[model samples]
Target: KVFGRCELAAAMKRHGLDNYRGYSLGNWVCAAKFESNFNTQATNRNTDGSTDYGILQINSRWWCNDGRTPGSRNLCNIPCSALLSSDITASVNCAKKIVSDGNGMNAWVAWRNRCKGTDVQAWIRGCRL
Candidate 1:
């Protein structure tokens, strides 16, 4: 947990928010909790036969880099190291971009909207630092 505080602070900063609004961490944490239990090294072969790896439960098959290597910028081209980067700010900034780009975090929003009884705001409200 050496990086716990650092990571949290970095994540908060990249999201451009001062507080979690209670549930702000809800969406991200929930996903992390469910997908990897906050284990940044978590990895698995999803039901569809694709490989899901790293914290944030990244699925390399679905979100690898667009280059020929498809993951040149990161470990296995999935940015695994970024998620696990010792530099909290770098990692969280990567997460923010992924989440905001209508693919990564937006997908969480959509999933939350459909599954959760409340809006993402409520989750943010309950999100603890």
Candidate 2:
């Protein structure tokens, strides 16, 4: 797992996500906290039978293939396992693409439910980004 929020923020910054596509670093950090608690190997099964993968909890129905799921759009074109790696390059790139698709973080239900309209500055409070 990530040591803390600061480390996650630094990694995101290194990947050009500090303020990517008009979304703040705090938003990403908060979303990650609620979504997967900074664990890269996190996964969750949806009631709809789809699964969410990685720290961002990207859905298998639209983003990646995990072999167990069928009819995945695989828009990210990377295996879901790639998102589970400590190296977040693939996941970051796919997340950027997902955000760039006009949905922003709204595409993530975790963001919509937990992070939307909330004060997110505390997410990066002690993080020296």
Candidate 3:
């Protein structure tokens, strides 16, 4: 099911408008939803069976704010609230850069086109709007 528009909008607001405003709210929500399922506590697992934590599912193996591991930080290293509070573009853009600098949002764009569709609504549901 689609998320509440207001809630989604608020999240965008909290995350700042730099990156999100240019993109459709629906598409942004879809990217975030698919990536973290709106679970602020969502995390990823590494091949070593170690914990890679945080909402955006940041990898713990990489540079963690203050040299703290994800497990040790209890996923508190990069708080979702911090990301939400910072510029959305900065946050997503940073994630993208970390993954593939300069081409970071490519995944989001790809997901939006492939899964959500070119139209805002269609991209959310895997069909043409």
Candidate 4:
């Protein structure tokens, strides 16, 4: 498990996510907290028969291959398990690609449902980024 918000933010910043593509660190932090509580191994099954993988909760329907799922575009061209690693590189790259594809933070339900329009500064409170 992650130690705390500061650690998570430090890791994200180390991976060059501090101010990526017009999105703030707070935006990513808030979304990650709700998406997976900063756990890299997080996964969730959607009612639509698709599974969300990793900290960002990327969907199997459009992003990665879980093998059990069909018709996955596999836009990231990586296995869903790759996203579960403690190393955030793969997940970070995939999330960047998702945002670059026009989805932005809207690609994550957590962002839309929880982080958006909220006071996200609390997510990075006392964190040295």
Candidate 1 TM-score to native: 0.50
User: Candidate 4, clashing residue pairs?
Assistant: none
lDDT value, residue 31 of candidate 2: 91
Q: How many residue pairs clash in each candidate?
A: 15, 0, 4, 0
Q: Candidate 3 local accuracy as lDDT? A: 0.45
Please report, in order, the local distance difference test score of every candidate based on alpha carbons: 0.47, 0.87, 0.45, 0.85
**What would the per-residue lDDT of candidate 3 be over residues 1-129, giving only the tens digit for each residue?**
223444554555455532443455555555656666654445565565444333344444542342434443322245433443323433454454453543444544434454455555543343222
Candidate 2 per-residue C-alpha lDDT over 1-129 given as tens digits, one digit per residue, 9 for 90 to 100: 553788988898899987798888889988999989999999999887889988899888989988877776899998899999999898899999999988889998889999978988788887777
lDDT of 1 by residue, 2-103 (tens): 225335434554665333332355455445545555566565655555555455555544454423333324423344445544344433445555555555
For model 2, state the Cα shift of residue 108 in Å. 0.9
Clashes of 4: 0
- Best-matching candidate per TM-score: 2
What are the clashing pairs of model 3?
A: 96-104, 116-122, 116-123, 117-123
Best by lDDT: 2
Q: Candidate 1 or 2, higher lDDT?
A: 2
- Candidate 4 has a TM-score of 0.93
